[PDB]
């Protein structure tokens, strides 16, 4: 599509915008993040590459918090992800202020997806280069997971995987019984999948980062305790 | 050979999914002199290497002043450094005036990142071409941060930036084990020893091209120049 | 200065002559603010941003300020293409009794003055 790919407001002869395609190709330049929805919660997991030992343990976090009931995992350009996280926090806070109760996840996903899509129409701005997931859990709604695309399209998923190696990650996710497991097994399965998909020659070393939101946390997003993370790492290494 | 059409603007995506102007701006930090920063359980210090154009000139200022508990070091362009310093000073002054409480370093860095991200997405602008090292003290203890032209910040614990900073970074990585249980004299000695690695093995760390900034719990931000750095330098060994 | 402007009293500019003067002078701005606030509270941040971007893009292709313009696309976007108000039939701006120099008004529009 050479000659029709210098602006976000130009159509190719076959009717397609190419800057958006380049933006969606830009997300496969980062590591792999996956998310699995289970019977009574949602479990996240990301593969973080260590740059140096000088950075503090807890820097360049890729698992954010929107409010006391919503998690978020990103992939792609980091600055755009931070800006989108700020926008999501603003939207959720404003909804809580006006209506007096917690915002449903579907409306938040719709608002953020439309805000992302708004950058696809004009030549004075540049499309975003990051894709992310959202998750929550309520007693009367259960687990919920969502996807956002740099083109601005959102969907609900049972299992999702974004990043450099989404194909293989999805291949191993599909052979699981999501609807008949709890978080205790899902965390180990996620660790095993992340260890399986990782490539050793290209990337020197990596450290895991796991989190869930579910019934046992009373619908609050939290970091996995250290002992559970260590035993999951041991299980994944032994199985590998 | 195929880069010609995809690297003149900051609002254009390359077919590989890259923005080349951001990388080109990041290449500008390596045009300045090396600076070194490290911290301990109580104090945070900044060490810079001044450079004069010729003999008949005064070395320019590399360590600036922001607030009673925050100080920065610069490497790269100068107009961008001045603009960022003005923004930081205004933010700190406004927060103090309104809330009667010092602006936290984490909030300051988040504001800096949010401001810097904007000119990398819209037309008619260019990314900032300066990298910063920020040292401060607040209720959570000493802090040290780094800022990138790509609107990214890292909460490091010992970092150096500038031209030929690899040797200093290697020395800091090797000796970071014994930094927490140290006091000011040997902390500054470690900083100076790390900075000395940048120079060729024929020069010396004389008292004419060194600037030191120290902040602490009961000590406000202080800058030592010329004869003021003499007490911090006699104890250094040979190369 | 002092010849390009005159007959202005500072003490007669702080106090409006009639209760309706300010409301009539700034009706469109208040209407836009109300609409944008309601839209932002109902749908989200994106809708007012899109509307303002469209308004800014449309308002940027007109005649130079010393000749009357039609403002067709702006009226289509706003919805004023099928309503007639008192601003249309009273004191027609296409037949104004006073007008300044061309270059001076073009410079004033850019803000160089």
């Amino acid at each position: 599509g050479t000659g029709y790919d210098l602006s976000a407001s130009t159509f190719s002869p076959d009717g397609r915008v190419f800057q958006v395609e380049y933006a969606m190709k830009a997300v496969e330049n980062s590591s792999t993040a996956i998310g699995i929805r289970c019977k009574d919660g949602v479990v996240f997991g990301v593969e973080k590459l260590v740059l140096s030992k000088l950075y503090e343990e807890g820097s360049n976090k890729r698992l954010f918090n929107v409010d006391r009931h919503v998690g978020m995992a990103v992939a792609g350009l980091l600055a755009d992800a931070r800006s989108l996280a700020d926008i999501a926090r603003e939207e959720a806070s404003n909804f809580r202020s006006n209506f007096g109760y917690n915002i449903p996840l579907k409306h938040l996903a719709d608002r953020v997806a439309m805000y992302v899509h708004a950058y696809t129409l004009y030549s004075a701005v540049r499309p975003f280069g990051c894709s992310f997931m959202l998750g929550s859990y309520s007693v009367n709604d259960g687990a919920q997971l969502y996807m956002i695309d740099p083109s601005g399209v959102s969907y609900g998923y049972w299992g999702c995987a974004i990043g450099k190696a989404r194909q293989a990650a999805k291949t191993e996710i599909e052979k699981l019984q999501m609807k008949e497991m709890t978080c205790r097994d899902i965390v180990k399965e996620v660790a095993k999948i992340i260890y399986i998909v990782h490539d050793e020659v290209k990337d020197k070393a990596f450290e895991l980062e796991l989190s869930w939101v579910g019934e046992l946390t009373n619908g609050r997003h939290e970091i996995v305790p250290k002992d559970i993370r260590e035993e999951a790492e041991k299980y994944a290494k032994e199985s590998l | 050979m195929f880069r010609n059409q995809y690297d003149n603007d900051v609002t254009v995506w390359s077919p590989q999914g890259r923005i080349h102007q951001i990388e080109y701006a990041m290449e500008a930090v390596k045009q300045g002199s090396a600076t070194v920063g490290l911290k301990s359980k109580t104090h945070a210090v900044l060490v810079a290497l001044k450079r004069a154009q010729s003999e008949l000139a005064a070395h320019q200022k590399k360590i600036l002043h922001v607030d009673n508990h925050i100080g920065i070091s610069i490497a790269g362009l100068t107009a961008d450094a001045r603009l960022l310093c003005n923004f930081m000073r205004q933010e700190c002054l406004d927060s103090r005036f309104v809330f009667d409480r010092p602006l936290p370093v984490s909030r300051l860095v988040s504001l800096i990142g949010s401001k810097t991200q904007i000119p990398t997405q819209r037309y008619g602008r260019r990314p900032y071409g300066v990298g910063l090292l920020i040292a401060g003290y607040d209720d959570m203890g000493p802090h040290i941060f780094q800022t990138c032209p790509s609107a990214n910040y890292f909460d490091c614990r010992a970092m150096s930036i500038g031209a030929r900073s690899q040797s200093a970074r290697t020395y800091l990585e090797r000796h970071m084990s014994e930094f927490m249980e140290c006091n000011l004299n040997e902390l500054v000695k470690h900083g100076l020893r790390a900075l000395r690695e940048t120079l060729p093995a024929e020069q010396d760390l004389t008292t004419k091209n060194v600037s030191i900034g120290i902040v602490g719990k009961d000590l406000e931000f202080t800058i030592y120049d010329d004869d003021d750095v003499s007490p911090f330098l006699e104890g250094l060994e040979e190369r | 200065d002092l010849l390009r402007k005159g007959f202005s009293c500072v003490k007669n500019e702080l106090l409006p002559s009639h209760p309706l003067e300010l409301s009539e002078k700034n009706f469109q701005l208040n209407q836009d603010k109300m609409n944008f606030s309601t839209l932002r509270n109902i749908q989200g941040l994106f809708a007012p941003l899109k509307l303002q971007m469209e308004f800014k893009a449309v308002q940027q292709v007109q005649r130079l300020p010393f000749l009357s313009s039609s403002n067709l696309s702006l009226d289509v976007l706003r919805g004023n293409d099928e309503t007639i108000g008192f601003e249309d039939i009273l004191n027609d701006p296409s037949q104004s009794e006073v007008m300044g120099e061309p270059h001076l008004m073009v410079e004033y529009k850019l803000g160089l003055l």
Binding site: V125 | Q117, I118, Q121, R122, Y123 | M53, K56
Partner: peptide
């Protein structure tokens, strides 16, 4: 970034 374009 878009809100900065307007004013």
């Amino acid at each position: 970034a878009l809100a900065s374009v307007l004013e």
